């Protein structure tokens, strides 16, 4: 359907309020490297529970 | 059987060739029955060696279906094609006294004590 008036800018703010993407909290350290990572996941270029990861 | 406008094989001594479903029985609000149903037939063809002539309307029951009838072991015996033995439309039991081709398991209950008792077939 079409509309009947021009909508509000208060609406535009309301519709995107419950959509915006999440994150982990706190700047990490790891048990085996001075590298920060995403927590509870492999350090992207260093050691997290032995080994390194990633290519290309 | 499962539908109408459905020709199926004679397996009776009252018509020839094929004979024609005018409706399926055993329930309303549905133009399809399950296996083991009662059909209403009109004879589409007939021959003089069989007892009845065309466009007469009679009752019938299933004697073969290539899906099988749930009656015999818990595992449906699937006999070749759809085929039907005509009944009487009031007085019950087969009007035809023969079957064409082999014997069936579909003729060994209470309603079939006039066709197996004969020596020329299902004996």
């Amino acid at each position: 359907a079409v509309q009947q008036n021009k909508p509000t800018r208060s609406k535009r703010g309301m519709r995107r309020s419950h959509d915006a993407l999440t994150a982990v909290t706190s700047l990490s350290v790891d048990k085996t490297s001075g590298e920060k990572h995403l927590r509870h996941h492999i350090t992207a270029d260093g050691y997290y529970r032995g080994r390194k990861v990633i290519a290309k | 059987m499962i539908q109408e406008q459905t020709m199926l094989n004679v397996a009776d001594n009252s018509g020839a060739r094929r004979v024609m479903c005018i409706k399926v029985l055993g329930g309303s609000h549905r133009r399809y029955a399950g296996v083991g149903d009662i059909i209403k037939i009109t004879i589409k063809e007939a021959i003089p060696r069989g007892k009845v002539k065309k466009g007469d309307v009679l009752k019938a029951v299933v004697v073969r279906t290539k899906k099988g009838v749930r009656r015999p072991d818990g595992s449906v015996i699937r006999f070749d094609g759809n085929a039907c033995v005509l009944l009487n439309n009031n007085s019950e039991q087969p009007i035809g006294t023969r079957i064409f081709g082999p014997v069936t398991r579909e003729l060994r209950s209470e309603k079939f004590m006039k066709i197996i008792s004969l020596a020329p077939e299902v004996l």
Partner: protein
């Protein structure tokens, strides 16, 4: 009267001495474990709580672990409870099984869960495809007119179009027990036990028929 929590576990076509053999559903109903048992100040109504399910119980919320600790130990995150007019049992486990289901020869299998997700498959919200006249196109399965007008009642209550199956607990009400079996606790129920295969259920007895 007491509802016994089963598990969907088994399916069997068992023969009977007549010329038909019967498909049946097999329910292990063993270890129904009390840890509370309520009485008639405890939420004001006397009823019995029983627990049947699958949990390691090492990494488990301490408010839950003490619930199990002060009485019968159990596993399972969720627990189920049932009203009664019979003698209530000691709260440190009772593990009562299939034997309850011979004093009635019908059960109400009630379920927990529902196992299909949507059931747009002509099961819970049903359809008929558009029967083809004049060269029909685009819509065949989207409902034609769900309302009426602002005098019949705009769009009426009690209509589904799309959504979810619910994942609630569903009855078939008063379905037959085929057999009860000691020494390994097997319930033969004849069919329509809810959920996907391997899902939990509740099985209470029939109070209606």
């Amino acid at each position: 009267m007491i509802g016994l929590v089963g598990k969907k576990v088994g399916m069997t076509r068992i023969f009977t001495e007549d010329g038909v053999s019967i498909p049946v559903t097999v329910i292990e109903v063993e270890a129904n474990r009390v840890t509370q048992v309520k009485d008639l100040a405890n939420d004001g109504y006397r009823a019995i709580q029983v627990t049947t399910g699958a949990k390691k119980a090492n990494r488990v919320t301490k408010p839950e672990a003490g619930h199990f600790a002060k009485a019968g130990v159990e596993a399972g995150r969720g627990l189920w409870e049932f009203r009664l007019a019979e003698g209530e049992e000691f709260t440190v486990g009772q593990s009562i099984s299939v034997e309850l289901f011979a004093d009635v020869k019908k059960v109400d299998v009630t379920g927990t869960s529902k196992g299909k997700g949507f059931a747009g498959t002509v099961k819970r919200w049903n359809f008929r495809t558009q029967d083809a006249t004049h060269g029909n196109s685009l819509s065949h399965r989207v409902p034609g007119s769900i309302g009426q007008n602002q005098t019949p009642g705009k769009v009426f209550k009690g209509k589904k179009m799309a959504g979810q199956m619910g994942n609630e607990r569903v009855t078939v009400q008063s379905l037959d027990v085929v057999r009860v079996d000691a020494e390994r606790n097997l319930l033969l129920v004849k069919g329509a036990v809810p959920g996907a295969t391997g899902s939990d259920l509740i099985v209470k007895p029939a109070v209606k028929a």
